[PDB]
Amino acid sequence: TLENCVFCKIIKRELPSTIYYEDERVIAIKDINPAAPVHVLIIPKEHIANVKEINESNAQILIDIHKAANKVAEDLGIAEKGYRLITNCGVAAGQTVFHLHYHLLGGVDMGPKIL
């Protein structure tokens, strides 16, 4: 855990959340400034800055991350039409919370341009 990390705080129940999935390794929460009708953040409980810090010792968390993305996509009714997953590394990529997460986005036709 990092003292000053909003997601770490959310995990330890120092701030509120809307939690769509949870276990000892990962949590999935509602993004409070959604960029699409369904916008969930899939967050590993271990504080790691972004995917640049993933390596041989911790990489299994990617599995949990994608597992929970799929389960939540089903639970929230976007799985069949589909969805986008995004993770960012660094401020140039738009990262503003430096604790690894994927954005699960869905419920609107997002179309051709990915950027």
Question: What positions carry a catalytic annotation?
Answer: 101
- Residue 39 in marked binding region: no
Smallest distance from the beta carbon of 18 to a copy of itself, in angstroms?
19
Taking Cα atoms as reference points, which of 34, 35, 43 lies closest to residue 6?
A: 43
Q: Build a one-symbol-per-residue string for 36-75: x at contacts with a copy of itself by CB under 8 A, - elsewhere.
A: x-------------xxx-x----xx-xx--xx-xx--x--
Among 47, 66, 67, 71, binds Zn ion (CB under 5 A): 47
Task: Please spell the DSSP secondary structure of 52-79, one letter per residue.
Answer: GG--TTTTTHHHHHHHHHHHHHHHTT-T
